[PDB]
Amino acid sequence: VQLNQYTLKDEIGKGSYGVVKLAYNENDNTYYAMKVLSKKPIEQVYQEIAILKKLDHPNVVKLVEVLDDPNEDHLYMVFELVNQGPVMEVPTLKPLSEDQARFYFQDLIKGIEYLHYQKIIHRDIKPSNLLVGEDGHIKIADFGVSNEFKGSDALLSNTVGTPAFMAPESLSETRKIFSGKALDVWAMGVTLYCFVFGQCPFMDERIMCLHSKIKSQALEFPDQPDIAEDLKDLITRMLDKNPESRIVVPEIKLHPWVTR
Numbered sequence: 001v002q003l004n005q006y007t008l009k010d011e012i013g014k015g016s017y018g019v020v021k022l023a024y025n026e027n028d029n030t031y032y033a034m035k036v037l038s039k040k041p042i043e044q045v046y047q048e049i050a051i052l053k054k055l056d057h058p059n060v061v062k063l064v065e066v067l068d069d070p071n072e073d074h075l076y077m078v079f080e081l082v083n084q085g086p087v088m089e090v091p092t093l094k095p096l097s098e099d100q101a102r103f104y105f106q107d108l109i110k111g112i113e114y115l116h117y118q119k120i121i122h123r124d125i126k127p128s129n130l131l132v133g134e135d136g137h138i139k140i141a142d143f144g145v146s147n148e149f150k151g152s153d154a155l156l157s158n159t160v161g162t163p164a165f166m167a168p169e170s171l172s173e174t175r176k177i178f179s180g181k182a183l184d185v186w187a188m189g190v191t192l193y194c195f196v197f198g199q200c201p202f203m204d205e206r207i208m209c210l211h212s213k214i215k216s217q218a219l220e221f222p223d224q225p226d227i228a229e230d231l232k233d234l235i236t237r238m239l240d241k242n243p244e245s246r247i248v249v250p251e252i253k254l255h256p257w258v259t260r
């Protein structure tokens with residue numbers, strides 16, 4: 001099963017986009033992650049490639065090349081392999097320790113800060129898009145619904161990403177305008193909660209009820225495991241339902257739980 005210089009091996013990830021397969025480059029004798037899509041708009045895929053091309057940071061994945069045959073339904077995006085895979089699956093019954101979560105969250109901060117400087121809102125931050133590399137550090141993946149903006153922030157009206165991680169101000173259903181950086185902070189907060197608890201803070205298999213909880217259910221902490229007050233404060237500040245008072249990234253950097 002060959003595609004120019006790449007030999008497609010087993011599937012390593014999966015999603016609505018298609019699949020990611022391990023891949024072997026015969027030229028340089030090296031494994032890569034191959035994202036395979038099937039046209040079925042396709043514009044959005046090319047928006048991601050444009051964003052990805054501009055990105056160069058240790059906590060962000062690296063697109064290597066794009067293989068697009070006008071006469072083939074499949075479109076191939078070659079990424080550098082982040083060899084240990086997602087940092088966790090949600091839900092799990094073995095969440096990370098605080099110090100493990102702190103370690104990874106520190107990577108998340110650096111990556112998100114870089115993307116915002118580069119004027120990219122990620123919009124699909126979640127533990128399964130945080131890939132763990134050879135040195136144990138996280139790289140941010142799946143820019144499938146990211147936005148680029150001009151100015152100091154994005155002014156958005158569309159609702160995309162993973163539902164359990166969407167921010168309440170993006171679920172208005174009246175097409176209201178909301179700012180972009182605070183959407184990534186919210187999802188970072190859901191993510192950190194997942195790190196330590198192994199489940200999202202707002203769950204419901206009915207989508208209406210999931211939206212309702214995100215918009216109107218006060219954040220609740222499980223008795224177990226008994227996490228630190230300063231970590232509760234940080235998650236509480238990141239999951240502030242009012243994006244105007246929600247904690248910003250420069251404050252997250254300085255937060256007591258992050259710096260200890």
Ligand SMILES: COc1ccc(C(=O)/C=C\Nc2cc(OC)c(C(=O)O)cc2Cl)cc1
Pocket residue numbers: 012013015017020033035048061079080081082083084085086131141142143144
């Ligand atoms: C346990 O071993 C494993 C090692 C690596 C993986 C893996 O790489 C999975 C996802 N890969 C990606 C997906 C993307 O979106 C769908 C994008 C993007 O579109 O930005 C980039 C990448 Cl790299 C999985 C398991």
Ligand SMILES: [Cl-]
Pocket residue numbers: 088089090126127128129
């Ligand atoms: Cl996840």
